[PDB]
Design a protein around this ligand. Sequence first.
Ligand SMILES: [Zn+2]
Ligand SMILES: [Zn+2]
Ligand SMILES: [Zn+2]
Ligand SMILES: [Zn+2]
Lengths: 55, 7
Amino acid sequence: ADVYEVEDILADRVNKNGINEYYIKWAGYDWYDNTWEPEQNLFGAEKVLKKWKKR
Amino acid sequence: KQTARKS
Ligand SMILES: [Zn+2]
Ligand SMILES: [Zn+2]
Ligand SMILES: [Zn+2]
Ligand SMILES: [Zn+2]
């Protein structure tokens, strides 16, 4: 439903709850649509997340 | 194909 394709992860931060959030480039959406998402929202994006974490 | 929930 509110689920979209991830093009890439661009940055990360820890919020106030100590949860990692990731700055997402959404495939097919322009850079003004980028959003910070908590780690759980990346359930469908295992490969790009692990690449981001290892780099 | 990578998917995620967008707030
Ligand atoms: Zn479903
Ligand atoms: Zn747009
Ligand atoms: Zn827009
Ligand atoms: Zn990092």
